[PDB]
Design a protein around this ligand. Structure first.
Ligand SMILES: N[C@H]1CC[C@H](Nc2cncc(-c3cccc(/C=C4\SC(=O)NC4=O)c3)n2)CC1
Length: 271
């Protein structure tokens, strides 16, 4: 308000508009996200009645006890919008931009990044939060430390064990049961999206652009990809939801063994 200086617009879209900023009191880098009230579908409430976007409830749930998920520092209400203050690593690059620039990632680098995304999604789920929009656009890379951060909880929901029948994340990462039936369970839909994301990292682009391709579930590799990495992708993209791996089965897969630590990853790949 006068607590923050605003710097450049970092992006805008379905998610409203997000700006780079600095917290005046201690110069802490922050991101400042403006969410229009008209565009919030889900509202939650705080343990004291205050009515908030669900995104704020979800961020508070996962605020606790990691570093692979973005931290909500503060929020404000305005007549037509909420304003969320989020942490901001610096230097940082969004993973979508990084893959635009480098193309397909070497498997060692994709394995370190993918592993870190699995740790961040397991943390959301352990805190009772389903993200519902895992994709390269929603992952930031801290370039000095090689640490990834999952961001943008504006499509997320409380995690539950029954079926979801609404969805507003990214269609090209959504599963065949959502396309066909408008119904999915949270964890198996999250594993499908992680299959899309892993194919995106190792091939430099997503496998499916059309509904008909998502429902057929046939995966073709246009880049040289090891048979263990293709096996994992094709498992995550199983057509039947119950044939997809759990998070523990993904992290015990042969392709996931010997992961680099984030700092080594930065030393080797991010300079
Ligand atoms: N949904 C797209 C909106 C454009 C954005 N693009 C960028 C580009 N550079 C930095 C950041 C950034 C930095 C620090 C924090 C955050 C956190 C956010 S942004 C958001 O919508 N929800 C968040 O939690 C984002 N975002 C990629 C998320």
């Amino acid at each position: 308000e006068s607590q923050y200086q605003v710097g450049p617009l970092l992006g805008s879209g379905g998610f409203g508009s997000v700006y780079s900023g600095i917290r005046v009191s201690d110069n802490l880098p922050v991101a400042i996200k403006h969410v229009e009230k008209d565009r919030i579908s889900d509202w939650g409430e705080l343990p004291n009645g205050t009515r908030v976007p669900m995104e704020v409830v979800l961020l508070k749930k996962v605020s606790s006890g990691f570093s692979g998920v973005i931290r909500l520092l503060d929020w404000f209400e305005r007549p037509d919008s909420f304003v969320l203050i989020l942490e901001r690593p610096e230097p940082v690059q969004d993973l979508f931009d990084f893959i635009t620039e480098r193309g397909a990632l070497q498997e060692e680098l994709a394995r370190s990044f993918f592993w870190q995304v699995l740790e961040a999604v397991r943390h959301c789920h352990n805190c009772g939060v389903l993200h519902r929009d895992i994709k390269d656009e929603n992952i930031l890379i801290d370039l000095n430390r090689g640490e990834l951060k999952l961001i943008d909880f504006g499509s997320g929901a409380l995690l539950k064990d029954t079926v979801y029948t609404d969805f507003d994340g990214t269609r090209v990462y959504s599963p065949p049961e959502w396309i066909r039936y408008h119904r999915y369970h949270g964890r198996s839909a999250a594993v499908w999206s992680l299959g899309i994301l892993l194919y995106d990292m190792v091939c430099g682009d997503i496998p499916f652009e059309h509904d008909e391709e998502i429902i057929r579930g046939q995966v073709f590799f246009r880049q040289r990809v090891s048979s263990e990495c293709q096996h994992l992708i094709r498992w995550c993209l199983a057509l039947r939801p119950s044939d997809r791996p759990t998070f523990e089965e993904i992290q015990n897969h042969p392709w996931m063994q010997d992961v680099l630590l984030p700092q080594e990853t930065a030393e080797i790949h991010l300079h």
